[PDB]
Amino acid sequence: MFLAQEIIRKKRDGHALSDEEIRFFINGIRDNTISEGQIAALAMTIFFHDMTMPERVSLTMAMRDSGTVLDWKSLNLNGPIVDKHSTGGVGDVTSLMLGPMVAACGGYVPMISGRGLGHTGGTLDKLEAIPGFDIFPDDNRFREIIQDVGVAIIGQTSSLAPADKRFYATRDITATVDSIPLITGSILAKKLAEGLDALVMDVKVGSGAFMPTYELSEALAEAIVGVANGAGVRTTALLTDMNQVLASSAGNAVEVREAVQFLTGEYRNPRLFDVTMALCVEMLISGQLAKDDAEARAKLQAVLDNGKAAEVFGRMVAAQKGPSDFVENYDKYLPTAMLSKAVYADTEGFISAMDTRALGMAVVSMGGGRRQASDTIDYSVGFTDMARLGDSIDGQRPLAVIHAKDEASWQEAAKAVKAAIILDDKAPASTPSVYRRITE
Amino acid sequence: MFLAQEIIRKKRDGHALSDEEIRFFINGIRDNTISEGQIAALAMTIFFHDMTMPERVSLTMAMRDSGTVLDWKSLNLNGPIVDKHSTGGVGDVTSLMLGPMVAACGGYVPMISGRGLGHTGGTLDKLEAIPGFDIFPDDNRFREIIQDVGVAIIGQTSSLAPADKRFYATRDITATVDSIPLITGSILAKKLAEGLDALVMDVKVGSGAFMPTYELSEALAEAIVGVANGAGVRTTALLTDMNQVLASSAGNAVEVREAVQFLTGEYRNPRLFDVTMALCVEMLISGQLAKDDAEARAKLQAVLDNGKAAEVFGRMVAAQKGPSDFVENYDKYLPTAMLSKAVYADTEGFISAMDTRALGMAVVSMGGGRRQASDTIDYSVGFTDMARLGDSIDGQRPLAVIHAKDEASWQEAAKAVKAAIILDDKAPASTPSVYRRITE
Numbered sequence: 026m027f028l029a030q031e032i033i034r035k036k037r038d039g040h041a042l043s044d045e046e047i048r049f050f051i052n053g054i055r056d057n058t059i060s061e062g063q064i065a066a067l068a069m070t071i072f073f074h075d076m077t078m079p080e081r082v083s084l085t086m087a088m089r090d091s092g093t094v095l096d097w098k099s100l101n102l103n104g105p106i107v108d109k110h111s112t113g114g115v116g117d118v119t120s121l122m123l124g125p126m127v128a129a130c131g132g133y134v135p136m137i138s139g140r141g142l143g144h145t146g147g148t149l150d151k152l153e154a155i156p157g158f159d160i161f162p163d164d165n166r167f168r169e170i171i172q173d174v175g176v177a178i179i180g181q182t183s184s185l186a187p188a189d190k191r192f193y194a195t196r197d198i199t200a201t202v203d204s205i206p207l208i209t210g211s212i213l214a215k216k217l218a219e220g221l222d223a224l225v226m227d228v229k230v231g232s233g234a235f236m237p238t239y240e241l242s243e244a245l246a247e248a249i250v251g252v253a254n255g256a257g258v259r260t261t262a263l264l265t266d267m268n269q270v271l272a273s274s275a276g277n278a279v280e281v282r283e284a285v286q287f288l289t290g291e292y293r294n295p296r297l298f299d300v301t302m303a304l305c306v307e308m309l310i311s312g313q314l315a316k317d318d319a320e321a322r323a324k325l326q327a328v329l330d331n332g333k334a335a336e337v338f339g340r341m342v343a344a345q346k347g348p349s350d351f352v353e354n355y356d357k358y359l360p361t362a363m364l365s366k367a368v369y370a371d372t373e374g375f376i377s378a379m380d381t382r383a384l385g386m387a388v389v390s391m392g393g394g395r396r397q398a399s400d401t402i403d404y405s406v407g408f409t410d411m412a413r414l415g416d417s418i419d420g421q422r423p424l425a426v427i428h429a430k431d432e433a434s435w436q437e438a439a440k441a442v443k444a445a446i447i448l449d450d451k452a453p454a455s456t457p458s459v460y461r462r463i464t465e
Numbered sequence: 466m467f468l469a470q471e472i473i474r475k476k477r478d479g480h481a482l483s484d485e486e487i488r489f490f491i492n493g494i495r496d497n498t499i500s501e502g503q504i505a506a507l508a509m510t511i512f513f514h515d516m517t518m519p520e521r522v523s524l525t526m527a528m529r530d531s532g533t534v535l536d537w538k539s540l541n542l543n544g545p546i547v548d549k550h551s552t553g554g555v556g557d558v559t560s561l562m563l564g565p566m567v568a569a570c571g572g573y574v575p576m577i578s579g580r581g582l583g584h585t586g587g588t589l590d591k592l593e594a595i596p597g598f599d600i601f602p603d604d605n606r607f608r609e610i611i612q613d614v615g616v617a618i619i620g621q622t623s624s625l626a627p628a629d630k631r632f633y634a635t636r637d638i639t640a641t642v643d644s645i646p647l648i649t650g651s652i653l654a655k656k657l658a659e660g661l662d663a664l665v666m667d668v669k670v671g672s673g674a675f676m677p678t679y680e681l682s683e684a685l686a687e688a689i690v691g692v693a694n695g696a697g698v699r700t701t702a703l704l705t706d707m708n709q710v711l712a713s714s715a716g717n718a719v720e721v722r723e724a725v726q727f728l729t730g731e732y733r734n735p736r737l738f739d740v741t742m743a744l745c746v747e748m749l750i751s752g753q754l755a756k757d758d759a760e761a762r763a764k765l766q767a768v769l770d771n772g773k774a775a776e777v778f779g780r781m782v783a784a785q786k787g788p789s790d791f792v793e794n795y796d797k798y799l800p801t802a803m804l805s806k807a808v809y810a811d812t813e814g815f816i817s818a819m820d821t822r823a824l825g826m827a828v829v830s831m832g833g834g835r836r837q838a839s840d841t842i843d844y845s846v847g848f849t850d851m852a853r854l855g856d857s858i859d860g861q862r863p864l865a866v867i868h869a870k871d872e873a874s875w876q877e878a879a880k881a882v883k884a885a886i887i888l889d890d891k892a893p894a895s896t897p898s899v900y901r902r903i904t905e
């Protein structure tokens with residue numbers, strides 16, 4: 026039973042574990058045959074001693090195989106099974122476009138997502154701003170949507186890398202979250218359960234990012250590329266900026282609106298376009314729907330610009346019990362805040378910094394996020410019309426438009442926002458939106 | 466925006482660019498306002514017309530200022546901010562001893578290093594063999610460490626001389642890499658960003674070096690010294706030998722072990738010692754901590770003999786979250802290969818030459834480094850007990866001891882080491898470890 030202690034001792038002393046050892050230990054996490062403190066202790070030895078590529082691959086494959094793994098050869102799709110994952114951000118709406126776009130160019134995209142965690146908005150909370158939108162279809166409904174529409178964005182079912190449930194739960198109370206190979210293992214366990222042929226990872230950089238410094242973000246990205254490819258899934262990673270809000274809006278309904286206007290062509294945020302297109306390029310190339318970058322981009326502009334991508338977003342929503350006509354009449358269905366007013370800076374000058382962590386928090390404090398489950402989310406609140414880094418601010422140029430349920434709520438977000446945007450007399454250095462492509 | 470093209474035209478027609486033009490062009494590279502082609506054009510005219518000393522100083526100060534530049538004034542430190550920089554080589558572990566030694570004699574040494582790279586292996590990879598050791602403290606941590614210990618070895622190069630990324634990338638596809646003022650600015654800027662008072666540069670010479678001939682090494686070294694001195698940083702260079710491995714080890718854990726034994730005195734390879742000494746001497750003198758070569762050597766030798774240098778390295782490991790007791794107990798923490806075993810030459814004779822790049826590559830294939838940046842390092846593997854040029858070889862005197870993760874890689878590394886080391890019937894001549902000192 027507690028032969029796990031043996032596996033702990035072996036790693037406490039700086040020796041590599043083997044597949045059977047790792048497999049054993051994981052399967053015991055899943056089965057409850059292994060104690061909490063035994064998970065904590067193993068976790069903390071890995072934080073101190075790290076892991077090697079064969080360990081990392083073994084740990085991911087073992088957590089991935091601890092629950093269901095989706096099988097697609099059964100349905101003879103003529104294209105690649107591909108997905109994308111993001112360490113999260115504020116305004117990180119990219120998936121709502123990216124799925125449809127890739128589907129539009131041949132990909133089959135089974136996107137299992139999650140809810141807002143901490144200060145970052147989660148995709149499922151955004152899609153559930155769409156009335157009747159159902160993130161939990163059954164196998165039949167689900168496979169059919171992927172076969173017909175080509176993309177679906179569903180919640181995490183309990184059968185998905187359940188070893189990770191307890192593993193992460195213990196990590197998060199034992200100061201053992203901050204370990205690249207452990208992070209890499211939980212992230213990839215899930216995404217690989219999907220049965221992928223290819224994957225792209227969007228690793229955020231900056232004030233509103235998971236990892237605090239660029240090089241740590243790089244480190245995680247490199248690790249994920251290595252392990253995922255190591256696991257037999259062609260994978261690339263992009264390091265993308267999160268030093269300001271990526272969309273022009275933050276929230277739930279307001280982000281769904283932006284996604285639709287992006288796909289139809291009503292409006293495209295320049296920074297959001299870059300990060301979105303590049304991630305879409307990667308999936309295409311990796312899934313072999315394109316030779317190089319230009320053939321990828323050309324095909325992706327194509328479906329952006331002939332309505333095919335907006336069209337397939339519309340079908341997906343229709344498939345998952347959303348409104349039939351949602352793309353055409355999104356304002357008919359998206360909730361509206363009771364109160365919508367601009368907030369203005371106190372000084373003149375240029376925007377030099379944005380505390381994105383804090384903006385993310387402020388949206389949660391308005392009801393966009395839940396502090397604890399069984400909190401009902403207000404889907405109408407958020408920010409729109411964000412000022413951006415570099416921008417010149419005066420009295421008639423607002424920092425954002427804040428959407429609140431009442432004035433007390435509004436005033437509080439106003440304060441948060443003014444506090445989180447710094448202005449200098451000097452216009453600052455430019456920030457690229459994509460920093461680095463990373464490949465095997 | 467394309468005052469760029471004016472600047473290209475100015476340089477093209479053989480004039481000297483002004484500081485302000487150079488600063489404008491460099492920042493345009495960082496912000497991406499200046500096109501790749503324009504960068505290529507600029508580099509190629511520099512390649513053709515060279516640059517005056519003033520232009521060289523401006524170009525490297527502009528790259529230095531293109532990102533973060535550490536300011537130490539506010540800590541009122543009462544010694545010099547000093548560092549080493551190197552063109553690098555195999556078994557070049559000097560930094561691990563040189564930082565502790567110079568700090569013990571009153572210098573402050575903020576070593577900021579890099580990652581990835583090829584045949585030669587990074588300092589941060591090496592330190593990361595120490596469980597728990599953190600190469601990414603935050604700024605206040607860093608200052609606190611430099612303030613309290615006097616040395617720290619971290620890895621946050623991202624916010625330093627960012628202009629050089631696009632610059633170098635572009636140089637490297639247009640055949641404009643090979644220009645001494647471009648090389649000088651690239652090599653020197655990241656290091657000048659640490660805000661140094663003094664600096665020594667180690668330019669390797671020999672088969673394993675970055676410049677192919679002694680002549681060219683000397684040229685580069687004179688350039689770097691001219692520029693760094695014009696940039697207000699007191700600098701000298703040394704030509705040091707790279708025709709064989711410098712230390713007796715090649716790898717990570719094995720090179721940390723050698724470094725600690727060098728400092729405690731348990732073992733000091735004579736060739737490594739000579740180099741490490743010569744470089745530490747430049748640092749004390751340039752940074753005004755010693756009046757001449759003999760006071761410096763005395764001060765350095767002393768902190769070796771009384772374990773003070775060793776103690777500084779220990780406090781540094783502690784301050785950067787390794788074990789407090791690393792120096793007394795390094796064998797308890799450092800990872801150990803599953804298999805370690807000597808390799809014997811096929812024939813008998815003297816070692817007459819050695820392909821260091823190959824040896825370096827042999828270590829990488831063992832997992833001791835990275836072919837792909839997505840690759841993960843096995844810290845436990847590498848070579849020890851390296852035979853040296855001039856050594857008599859036979860069945861009782863092995864080439865090296867290979868530390869491998871399994872017999873298959875061992876057997877593989879052993880062919881690599883046999884092939885790399887060329888024996889001869891008659892002894893070769895010997896050369897110095899340290900060649901010319903350059904003060905310009």
Ligand SMILES: Cc1cn([C@H]2C[C@H](O)[C@@H](CO)O2)c(=O)[nH]c1=O
Nearest residue numbers: 111112113139202207208211212
């Ligand atoms: C730290 C950590 C975050 N996450 C986050 C990353 C993503 O932002 C989110 C996906 O729902 O889960 C993990 O899945 N595992 C982890 O170990």
Ligand SMILES: Cc1cn([C@H]2C[C@H](O)[C@@H](CO)O2)c(=O)[nH]c1=O
Nearest residue numbers: 273274282283291292409410411
């Ligand atoms: C048409 C248009 C919409 N928007 C919207 C898109 C999003 O719905 C909103 C989020 O701030 O801003 C602009 O920022 N500029 C525009 O020109």
Ligand SMILES: Cc1cn([C@H]2C[C@H](O)[C@@H](CO)O2)c(=O)[nH]c1=O
Nearest residue numbers: 551552553642647648651652675
């Ligand atoms: C040409 C060139 C090489 N390098 C290489 C030389 C050295 O081998 C290494 C510095 O550690 O990087 C630069 O850093 N900048 C340059 O411009």
Ligand SMILES: Cc1cn([C@H]2C[C@H](O)[C@@H](CO)O2)c(=O)[nH]c1=O
Nearest residue numbers: 713714719722723732849850851
């Ligand atoms: C004591 C001793 C150690 N060493 C070195 C071999 C290894 O490279 C190092 C231990 O890592 O110590 C020698 O080369 N000769 C000696 O006499």
